[PDB]
Amino acid sequence: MEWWVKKVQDNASASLCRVVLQSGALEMIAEIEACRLRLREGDKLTPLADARYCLNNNPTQTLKIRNATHYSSERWTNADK
């Protein structure tokens, strides 16, 4: 289903941004690899087919996930360390 981002960090590392995807109430964390960095809070990510996702329902601004996580404590504690 369409997810909703709650937070996002630009590629302050080099070319990998992190986004927290919310779903109804649960939360998830996933590493993103893009270059537009035009993401923003309230962005609607729809499912493409295999795993990719399209924001704003525009297959042009798509991105690839490097590793999604169910908002685990180790990831949230090791990520926003």
Q: Which two tokens stand for residue 33?
A: 């690899």
Question: What is the helix (H) or strand (E) element at residue 73, kind and residue range?
Answer: helix 73-79
Architecture of the 1-81 domain: Beta Barrel (2.40)
* Helical segments of the chain, H only: 73-79
How many residues would you count in the chain?
81
Domains in the chain: boundaries: 1-81
* b/e map 30-53, b = 16+ CB within 10 Å: bbbebeeeebeeebebeeeeeeeb
